[PDB]
Write a structure and sequence with these properties.
InterPro entries: Cro/C1-type_HTH (IPR001387), Lambda_DNA-bd_dom_sf (IPR010982), Toxin_antidote_HigA (IPR013430). The chain is mainly α. About 65% of the residues lie in helices and about 0% in strands. The structure holds magnesium ion.
Length: about 90
């Protein structure tokens, strides 16, 4: 999903993929992988997005985490895990 928000921000600016990659100082293919979600949004990328597009690094990272946590939540055996008690 983070890639969707990035592309939506770019559409509003009328900025193309190549112009985005150029400003981000990344290769075109890396930019595409980021926008399509084929490449996770790392801390360095979060920092770059904050400067180049806007908002804070955490905002971008949280979009990533929200998507990752949403996916992993149903794959974890939370049903059998228990809260630790004071020993
Ligand atoms: Mg690159």
């Amino acid at each position: 999903r983070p890639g969707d928000i990035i592309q939506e921000s770019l559409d509003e600016l009328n900025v193309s993929l190549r112009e985005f990659a150029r400003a981000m100082e990344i290769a075109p293919s890396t930019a595409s992988r980021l926008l399509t979600g084929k490449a996770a949004l790392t801390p360095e990328m979060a920092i770059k997005l904050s400067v180049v597009i806007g908002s804070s690094p955490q905002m971008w990272l949280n979009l990533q985490n929200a998507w990752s946590l949403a996916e992993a939540e149903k794959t974890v055996d939370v049903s059998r895990l228990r809260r630790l008690v004071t020993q």
